[PDB]
Short mmCIF file of C-alpha atoms in Angstrom, two decimals:
data_model
loop_
_atom_site.label_atom_id
_atom_site.label_comp_id
_atom_site.label_asym_id
_atom_site.label_seq_id
_atom_site.Cartn_x
_atom_site.Cartn_y
_atom_site.Cartn_z
CA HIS A 20 -4.61 13.86 -70.41
CA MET A 21 -3.09 16.45 -68.06
CA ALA A 22 -4.36 16.76 -64.47
CA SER A 23 -6.02 19.98 -63.46
CA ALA A 24 -6.42 21.95 -60.30
CA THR A 25 -8.83 24.84 -59.78
CA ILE A 26 -8.22 27.59 -57.24
CA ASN A 27 -11.51 29.34 -56.34
CA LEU A 28 -10.65 32.75 -54.91
CA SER A 29 -14.30 33.35 -54.05
CA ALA A 30 -14.57 30.37 -51.68
CA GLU A 31 -12.88 31.65 -48.53
CA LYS A 32 -11.82 29.26 -45.78
CA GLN A 33 -9.83 30.12 -42.67
CA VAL A 34 -7.87 33.33 -42.06
CA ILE A 35 -4.22 32.48 -41.44
CA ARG A 36 -2.77 33.54 -38.09
CA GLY A 37 0.78 32.33 -38.71
CA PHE A 38 3.56 29.82 -38.20
CA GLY A 39 6.34 29.38 -35.70
CA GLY A 40 7.89 27.28 -33.01
CA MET A 41 8.92 26.90 -29.38
CA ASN A 42 11.61 28.58 -27.29
CA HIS A 43 12.38 26.92 -23.94
CA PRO A 44 15.36 28.63 -22.26
CA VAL A 45 15.07 26.50 -19.11
CA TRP A 46 15.15 23.02 -20.74
CA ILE A 47 17.55 24.03 -23.51
CA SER A 48 19.59 27.11 -24.44
CA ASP A 49 17.74 30.30 -25.36
CA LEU A 50 17.79 31.54 -28.91
CA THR A 51 20.77 33.79 -29.49
CA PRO A 52 20.35 37.33 -30.88
CA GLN A 53 21.21 36.10 -34.42
CA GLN A 54 18.86 33.12 -34.15
CA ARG A 55 15.96 35.34 -33.07
CA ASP A 56 16.38 37.33 -36.29
CA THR A 57 16.65 34.17 -38.40
CA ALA A 58 13.45 32.81 -36.84
CA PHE A 59 11.18 35.88 -36.82
CA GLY A 60 12.48 38.02 -39.66
CA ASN A 61 11.18 37.38 -43.15
CA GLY A 62 14.21 38.51 -45.12
CA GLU A 63 16.58 36.42 -47.17
CA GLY A 64 17.80 33.49 -45.08
CA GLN A 65 15.08 33.96 -42.44
CA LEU A 66 12.15 31.66 -41.62
CA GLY A 67 9.37 34.22 -41.55
CA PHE A 68 7.86 32.91 -38.35
CA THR A 69 5.14 35.05 -36.77
CA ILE A 70 4.24 32.99 -33.70
CA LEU A 71 6.49 32.25 -30.73
CA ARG A 72 5.40 29.66 -28.20
CA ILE A 73 6.86 29.78 -24.70
CA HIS A 74 6.28 27.90 -21.46
CA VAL A 75 4.82 29.16 -18.20
CA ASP A 76 7.25 27.92 -15.59
CA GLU A 77 5.83 26.55 -12.34
CA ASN A 78 8.65 28.49 -10.61
CA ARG A 79 8.21 32.23 -11.04
CA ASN A 80 11.93 32.76 -10.55
CA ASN A 81 12.38 31.34 -14.06
CA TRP A 82 9.95 33.74 -15.78
CA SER A 83 12.65 36.34 -16.47
CA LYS A 84 14.42 33.87 -18.72
CA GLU A 85 11.66 34.21 -21.34
CA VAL A 86 11.75 37.93 -21.79
CA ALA A 87 14.53 38.75 -24.26
CA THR A 88 13.44 36.25 -26.89
CA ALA A 89 9.74 37.06 -26.47
CA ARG A 90 10.37 40.79 -26.76
CA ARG A 91 12.56 40.37 -29.83
CA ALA A 92 9.90 38.20 -31.51
CA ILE A 93 7.37 40.95 -30.88
CA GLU A 94 9.75 43.62 -32.24
CA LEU A 95 9.94 41.51 -35.41
CA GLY A 96 6.16 41.34 -35.71
CA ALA A 97 5.35 38.03 -34.03
CA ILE A 98 2.73 37.16 -31.46
CA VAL A 99 3.51 35.12 -28.36
CA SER A 100 1.49 32.37 -26.73
CA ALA A 101 2.36 30.61 -23.48
CA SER A 102 1.60 27.10 -22.20
CA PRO A 103 2.06 25.67 -18.70
CA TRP A 104 3.27 22.13 -18.02
CA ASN A 105 2.61 22.10 -14.25
CA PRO A 106 1.03 24.37 -11.69
CA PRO A 107 3.23 25.36 -8.75
CA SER A 108 3.78 22.35 -6.52
CA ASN A 109 1.68 23.76 -3.69
CA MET A 110 -1.39 23.50 -5.95
CA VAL A 111 -0.79 19.93 -7.11
CA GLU A 112 -1.67 16.60 -5.57
CA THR A 113 -0.93 13.05 -6.53
CA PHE A 114 -3.32 10.31 -7.55
CA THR A 115 -3.29 6.91 -9.18
CA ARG A 116 -4.24 6.93 -12.87
CA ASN A 117 -4.98 3.64 -14.63
CA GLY A 118 -2.99 1.82 -11.96
CA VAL A 119 0.06 4.10 -12.23
CA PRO A 120 0.72 5.82 -8.90
CA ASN A 121 2.18 9.22 -8.09
CA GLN A 122 0.58 11.02 -11.03
CA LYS A 123 -0.07 14.74 -10.78
CA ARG A 124 -3.25 16.76 -11.08
CA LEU A 125 -4.38 20.23 -10.04
CA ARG A 126 -6.12 20.00 -6.64
CA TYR A 127 -9.83 20.58 -7.03
CA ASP A 128 -9.67 23.29 -4.33
CA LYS A 129 -6.89 25.16 -6.19
CA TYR A 130 -8.61 26.09 -9.47
CA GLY A 131 -8.88 29.71 -8.37
CA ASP A 132 -5.28 29.77 -7.18
CA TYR A 133 -4.25 28.42 -10.58
CA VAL A 134 -6.08 31.26 -12.34
CA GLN A 135 -4.05 33.62 -10.16
CA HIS A 136 -0.79 31.91 -11.14
CA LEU A 137 -1.63 32.27 -14.84
CA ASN A 138 -2.67 35.89 -14.35
CA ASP A 139 0.55 36.57 -12.44
CA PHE A 140 2.50 35.27 -15.45
CA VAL A 141 0.46 37.40 -17.85
CA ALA A 142 1.06 40.44 -15.65
CA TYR A 143 4.80 39.77 -15.26
CA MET A 144 5.23 39.45 -18.98
CA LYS A 145 3.17 42.61 -19.64
CA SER A 146 5.30 44.51 -17.12
CA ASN A 147 8.39 43.40 -19.03
CA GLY A 148 7.15 44.42 -22.52
CA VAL A 149 5.49 41.18 -23.63
CA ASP A 150 1.71 41.44 -24.20
CA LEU A 151 0.81 37.73 -24.54
CA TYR A 152 -1.56 36.87 -27.34
CA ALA A 153 -2.88 33.88 -25.37
CA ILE A 154 -2.23 31.55 -22.47
CA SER A 155 -3.14 27.87 -22.26
CA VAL A 156 -4.76 25.93 -19.45
CA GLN A 157 -2.42 22.96 -19.82
CA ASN A 158 0.07 21.50 -22.26
CA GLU A 159 -1.07 17.94 -23.19
CA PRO A 160 -3.48 17.30 -20.32
CA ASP A 161 -4.10 13.86 -21.86
CA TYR A 162 -0.43 12.83 -22.11
CA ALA A 163 0.81 13.96 -18.72
CA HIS A 164 2.96 11.05 -17.59
CA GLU A 165 5.69 13.61 -16.94
CA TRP A 166 3.53 16.60 -15.97
CA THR A 167 -0.06 17.46 -14.87
CA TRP A 168 -3.09 15.44 -16.02
CA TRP A 169 -6.54 16.84 -16.64
CA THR A 170 -9.53 14.70 -17.50
CA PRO A 171 -12.07 16.10 -19.98
CA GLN A 172 -14.35 16.82 -17.01
CA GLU A 173 -11.67 18.68 -15.05
CA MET A 174 -10.75 20.74 -18.13
CA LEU A 175 -14.44 21.56 -18.65
CA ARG A 176 -14.90 22.69 -15.05
CA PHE A 177 -11.91 24.97 -15.40
CA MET A 178 -13.05 26.41 -18.73
CA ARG A 179 -16.63 26.89 -17.53
CA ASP A 180 -16.15 28.23 -14.01
CA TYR A 181 -12.65 29.72 -13.87
CA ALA A 182 -11.18 30.62 -17.27
CA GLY A 183 -13.32 33.77 -17.67
CA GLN A 184 -11.13 35.26 -14.90
CA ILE A 185 -7.93 34.95 -17.00
CA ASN A 186 -6.65 38.34 -18.23
CA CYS A 187 -5.69 37.08 -21.65
CA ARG A 188 -7.03 35.02 -24.51
CA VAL A 189 -7.50 31.46 -23.27
CA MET A 190 -6.20 28.49 -25.21
CA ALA A 191 -7.37 24.91 -24.60
CA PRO A 192 -7.03 21.96 -24.40
CA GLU A 193 -3.79 21.20 -26.30
CA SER A 194 -4.44 17.46 -26.59
CA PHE A 195 -1.28 15.62 -27.63
CA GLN A 196 -3.04 14.12 -30.66
CA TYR A 197 -6.06 16.42 -31.22
CA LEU A 198 -8.27 13.94 -29.35
CA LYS A 199 -11.78 15.32 -29.57
CA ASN A 200 -12.82 13.89 -26.20
CA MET A 201 -10.72 16.64 -24.59
CA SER A 202 -12.34 19.49 -26.50
CA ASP A 203 -15.93 18.35 -27.15
CA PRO A 204 -17.12 19.22 -23.65
CA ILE A 205 -15.81 22.79 -24.00
CA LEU A 206 -17.48 23.27 -27.37
CA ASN A 207 -20.74 21.80 -26.09
CA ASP A 208 -20.93 24.09 -23.03
CA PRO A 209 -21.91 27.66 -23.93
CA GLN A 210 -20.11 29.25 -20.95
CA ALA A 211 -16.93 27.24 -21.39
CA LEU A 212 -17.00 28.02 -25.09
CA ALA A 213 -17.52 31.73 -24.33
CA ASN A 214 -14.42 31.60 -22.12
CA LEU A 215 -12.38 29.88 -24.84
CA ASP A 216 -10.53 32.02 -27.38
CA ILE A 217 -8.27 29.52 -29.15
CA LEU A 218 -8.77 25.80 -29.62
CA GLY A 219 -5.24 24.52 -29.44
CA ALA A 220 -4.15 21.00 -30.51
CA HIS A 221 -0.95 19.02 -30.97
CA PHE A 222 -0.46 16.63 -33.88
CA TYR A 223 1.59 13.74 -32.51
CA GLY A 224 0.25 10.66 -34.32
CA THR A 225 -2.74 12.57 -35.68
CA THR A 226 -3.87 10.96 -38.90
CA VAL A 227 -5.48 12.88 -41.76
CA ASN A 228 -8.89 11.39 -41.07
CA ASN A 229 -8.67 12.92 -37.55
CA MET A 230 -7.87 16.42 -38.76
CA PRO A 231 -11.42 17.56 -39.61
CA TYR A 232 -13.52 18.62 -36.61
CA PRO A 233 -17.21 19.00 -37.45
CA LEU A 234 -18.16 20.18 -33.96
CA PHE A 235 -15.67 23.02 -34.15
CA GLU A 236 -16.94 23.97 -37.61
CA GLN A 237 -20.44 24.09 -36.08
CA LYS A 238 -19.76 25.87 -32.81
CA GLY A 239 -16.41 27.69 -33.15
CA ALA A 240 -17.45 31.06 -34.54
CA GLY A 241 -15.12 33.74 -33.22
CA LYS A 242 -12.60 31.13 -31.98
CA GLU A 243 -9.19 30.53 -33.50
CA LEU A 244 -7.87 27.05 -34.32
CA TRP A 245 -4.14 26.50 -33.73
CA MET A 246 -1.84 23.50 -34.07
CA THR A 247 0.45 24.50 -31.25
CA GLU A 248 3.09 21.77 -31.16
CA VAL A 249 4.48 18.99 -33.32
CA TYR A 250 7.63 17.63 -34.81
CA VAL A 251 7.31 15.26 -37.79
CA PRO A 252 8.03 12.62 -38.80
CA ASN A 253 10.41 12.03 -35.86
CA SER A 254 12.83 13.73 -33.49
CA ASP A 255 15.83 11.67 -34.62
CA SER A 256 19.16 13.30 -33.86
CA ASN A 257 20.66 15.19 -36.79
CA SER A 258 17.65 14.39 -39.00
CA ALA A 259 16.63 17.91 -40.08
CA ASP A 260 18.33 17.79 -43.49
CA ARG A 261 17.19 14.24 -44.41
CA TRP A 262 15.63 14.07 -47.87
CA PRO A 263 13.04 13.04 -48.94
CA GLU A 264 12.03 12.60 -45.27
CA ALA A 265 11.64 16.36 -44.87
CA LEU A 266 8.73 16.39 -47.32
CA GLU A 267 6.67 14.94 -44.49
CA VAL A 268 6.86 18.35 -42.82
CA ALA A 269 5.35 20.08 -45.85
CA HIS A 270 2.72 17.36 -46.17
CA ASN A 271 1.79 17.67 -42.50
CA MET A 272 1.37 21.44 -42.88
CA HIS A 273 -0.69 20.98 -46.05
CA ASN A 274 -2.86 18.55 -44.13
CA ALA A 275 -3.22 20.89 -41.14
CA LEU A 276 -4.27 23.76 -43.40
CA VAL A 277 -6.54 21.94 -45.82
CA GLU A 278 -7.82 18.90 -43.90
CA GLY A 279 -7.85 20.58 -40.51
CA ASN A 280 -8.62 24.21 -41.43
CA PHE A 281 -5.91 25.21 -38.98
CA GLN A 282 -5.02 28.90 -38.70
CA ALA A 283 -1.61 28.37 -37.06
CA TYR A 284 1.05 25.68 -37.20
CA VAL A 285 3.73 25.75 -34.50
CA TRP A 286 6.72 23.44 -34.30
CA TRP A 287 8.42 22.25 -31.11
CA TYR A 288 11.95 23.64 -30.50
CA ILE A 289 12.89 26.14 -33.17
CA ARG A 290 16.62 25.40 -32.87
CA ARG A 291 17.37 21.68 -32.66
CA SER A 292 19.06 19.03 -34.75
CA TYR A 293 15.60 17.79 -35.90
CA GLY A 294 14.06 21.27 -36.08
CA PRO A 295 13.60 24.05 -38.58
CA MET A 296 16.81 25.78 -37.47
CA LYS A 297 19.97 23.73 -37.03
CA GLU A 298 22.36 24.19 -34.10
CA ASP A 299 24.65 26.17 -36.43
CA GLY A 300 21.88 28.77 -36.78
CA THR A 301 21.06 28.00 -40.43
CA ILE A 302 17.81 26.72 -41.87
CA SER A 303 17.37 22.93 -42.24
CA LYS A 304 15.45 21.11 -44.96
CA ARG A 305 12.61 20.76 -42.49
CA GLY A 306 12.81 24.54 -41.97
CA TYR A 307 12.63 25.20 -45.70
CA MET A 308 9.48 23.04 -45.77
CA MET A 309 7.97 25.35 -43.17
CA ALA A 310 9.27 28.43 -45.03
CA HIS A 311 7.39 27.47 -48.19
CA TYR A 312 4.33 28.40 -46.16
CA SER A 313 5.62 30.85 -43.55
CA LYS A 314 7.56 33.22 -45.82
CA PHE A 315 4.67 33.62 -48.25
CA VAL A 316 1.33 32.88 -46.57
CA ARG A 317 1.41 35.87 -44.22
CA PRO A 318 -0.85 36.53 -41.27
CA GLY A 319 -4.21 37.76 -42.49
CA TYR A 320 -4.16 35.93 -45.78
CA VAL A 321 -7.16 33.67 -46.23
CA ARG A 322 -7.08 30.09 -47.42
CA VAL A 323 -9.36 29.43 -50.38
CA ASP A 324 -10.93 26.33 -51.83
CA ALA A 325 -8.52 24.62 -54.25
CA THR A 326 -8.18 21.16 -55.72
CA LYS A 327 -6.16 19.62 -52.92
CA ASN A 328 -4.79 16.45 -54.52
CA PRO A 329 -5.02 16.91 -58.30
CA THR A 330 -3.03 13.78 -59.21
CA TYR A 331 -1.44 11.03 -57.11
CA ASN A 332 1.46 12.26 -54.95
CA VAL A 333 0.69 15.99 -55.65
CA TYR A 334 -0.84 18.20 -52.93
CA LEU A 335 -1.95 21.78 -53.41
CA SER A 336 -3.13 24.56 -51.12
CA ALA A 337 -3.88 28.18 -51.93
CA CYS A 338 -4.30 31.37 -49.97
CA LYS A 339 -5.28 34.86 -50.99
CA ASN A 340 -4.20 38.30 -49.86
CA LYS A 341 -7.49 40.21 -49.61
CA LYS A 342 -5.73 43.54 -50.02
CA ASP A 343 -4.94 42.89 -53.73
CA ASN A 344 -6.48 39.46 -54.47
CA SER A 345 -3.05 38.00 -55.12
CA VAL A 346 -2.55 34.35 -54.60
CA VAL A 347 -0.03 32.04 -52.96
CA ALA A 348 -0.14 28.36 -53.93
CA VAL A 349 2.02 25.73 -52.23
CA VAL A 350 2.39 22.53 -54.24
CA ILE A 351 4.09 19.39 -52.97
CA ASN A 352 5.23 16.67 -55.44
CA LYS A 353 6.13 13.53 -53.47
CA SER A 354 6.62 11.48 -56.63
CA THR A 355 9.99 10.37 -57.93
CA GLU A 356 8.58 11.52 -61.31
CA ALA A 357 8.07 15.03 -62.60
CA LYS A 358 4.42 15.99 -62.72
CA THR A 359 2.78 18.46 -65.11
CA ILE A 360 -0.57 20.00 -64.13
CA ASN A 361 -2.79 22.86 -65.25
CA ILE A 362 -3.73 25.31 -62.51
CA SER A 363 -6.91 27.26 -63.28
CA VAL A 364 -7.63 30.45 -61.30
CA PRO A 365 -10.90 31.72 -62.78
CA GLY A 366 -11.48 35.44 -62.44
CA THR A 367 -7.88 36.40 -61.54
CA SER A 368 -6.11 39.35 -63.23
CA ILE A 369 -2.76 37.76 -62.38
CA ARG A 370 -0.84 36.62 -65.44
CA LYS A 371 2.72 36.16 -64.18
CA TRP A 372 3.51 33.57 -61.58
CA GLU A 373 6.85 33.51 -59.72
CA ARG A 374 8.06 30.21 -58.24
CA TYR A 375 10.39 29.09 -55.52
CA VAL A 376 11.43 25.45 -55.38
CA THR A 377 13.04 23.18 -52.79
CA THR A 378 14.38 19.73 -53.60
CA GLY A 379 17.14 17.61 -52.13
CA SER A 380 19.68 19.84 -53.90
CA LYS A 381 18.38 23.40 -53.61
CA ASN A 382 16.47 25.53 -51.10
CA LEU A 383 13.75 28.01 -52.09
CA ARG A 384 15.41 28.50 -55.47
CA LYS A 385 13.65 31.10 -57.60
CA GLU A 386 13.01 29.40 -60.93
CA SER A 387 11.68 30.83 -64.19
CA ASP A 388 8.43 32.80 -64.08
CA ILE A 389 5.39 31.27 -65.61
CA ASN A 390 3.24 33.29 -67.93
CA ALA A 391 -0.43 32.30 -67.86
CA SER A 392 -2.67 31.26 -70.75
CA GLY A 393 -5.48 33.59 -69.67
CA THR A 394 -6.55 32.37 -66.22
CA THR A 395 -4.81 28.96 -66.51
CA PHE A 396 -1.21 28.31 -65.72
CA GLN A 397 0.66 25.06 -66.75
CA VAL A 398 3.43 23.96 -64.44
CA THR A 399 5.91 21.06 -64.35
CA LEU A 400 6.74 20.11 -60.75
CA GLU A 401 10.16 18.63 -60.23
CA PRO A 402 10.34 15.21 -58.55
CA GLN A 403 10.35 15.22 -54.74
CA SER A 404 9.87 18.93 -54.44
CA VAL A 405 7.90 21.74 -52.91
CA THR A 406 7.04 24.78 -55.01
CA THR A 407 5.52 28.03 -53.81
CA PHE A 408 3.87 30.12 -56.56
CA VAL A 409 3.41 33.84 -55.83
#
């Protein structure tokens, strides 16, 4: 016996929008000129990110701080999305939430004023060379101990009655854990849904069984699905090179793509001691896990149906470039054993497969090509490894 996986290039799933991370030049230091290139270029030694997330500061005097990094990302081919943490203080009021006093929410009489704030940010960025791809209603409205809370009902009212006035794609609701109670009302209201452009979600503590979303599959035509913030499996200091811990990053991305049908996967801080880029400006193990997807599965490629878990501890995803029907497969082997599988790609003309491998001891190493037996390809996966086949 040898386990088999089949990649079905005719069974198209979601179109990939891209991968990236956060810049926050108010809370932490901005990316440097070199770091911007390492993040958003796709050359040797670069992450290949194509999505930058930024924050919408409540104080407009901080907006200028975003511009250089956002513009450089765009020069390098990325798109930029922005999320607010709080409205300006003159729009906020306090309330008691589950017995905890002094919590913040948007005043019910300030929904229109909040639209204007968001539009002012969009306009400021446009005036300074940054055409935002999208703007969000609220970062983590359901985990707002340290920012602004929105109930599902409040979020729905905004999406239904106000968000059509926003001069940008609208992203919502960015639940901290992809809690469907925050998004169901939007999807179930035709006007709110019409005003939505991107269903955004974070993945903190989101289990695999909570990654599918039948209601979105039913109602989300013409809407994008983005995982707009996570770090996994922790934010421990100086953890970004830990192995085999870093394989959790690859596995989480596999799960987002295959179990969640996500079109985008966006880390928290790009440069951080637990992030994809270390403080010394070089790529971490966690960053190489991202790169196995980001450098190869380019915007516009389409995920296809493929045997997702062909043998225990082995996870496989595949995407296709519609321009030439070429294929990118990302295969994770979490076992301490080597694993040999057959990969069948019926109907492909491809016969030579290149492979790049990361383990605890090498990063995106180009290994020997594999020559196919017709439309089947036999591959031995090193222990505790990620391999991208192209």
